[PDB]
């Protein structure tokens, strides 16, 4: 299934959570969660997240958990 781009998307992996902001891109959610989330506790602290992506928006905050 496709997820609703619109900007910040909680992203989950069997290895690693990120969170990716956009609202008409697309191509990012596959093999893990990134769930329709606008904002949260920490896509908005200041990780790695990039600016430019395939469509207009951008953004990469991940971390290393549990994993």
Same mark, same amino acid.
């Given at each position: 299934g =496709?997820? !609703?781009?619109?900007? =910040?998307?909680? +992203?989950?992996? /069997?290895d ?5 902001? +956009?609202?008409? @891109?697309?191509?990012?959610? =596959?093999?893990?969660? +990134?769930? /329709?989330? /606008?904002? @949260? /506790?920490? &896509? ?8 430019p992506? =395939? !469509?207009?928006? &951008?953004? !990469? !905050? &991940?971390?290393?958990?549990?994993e």
């Amino acid at each position: 299934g =496709s997820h !609703t781009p619109d900007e =910040s998307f909680l +992203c989950y992996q /069997p290895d690693q959570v990120c969170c990716f902001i +956009c609202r008409g @891109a697309a191509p990012l959610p =596959s093999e893990g969660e +990134c769930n /329709p989330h /606008p904002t @949260a /506790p920490w &896509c908005r602290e200041g990780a790695v997240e990039w600016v430019p992506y =395939s !469509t207009g928006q &951008c953004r !990469t !905050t &991940c971390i290393p958990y549990v994993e």
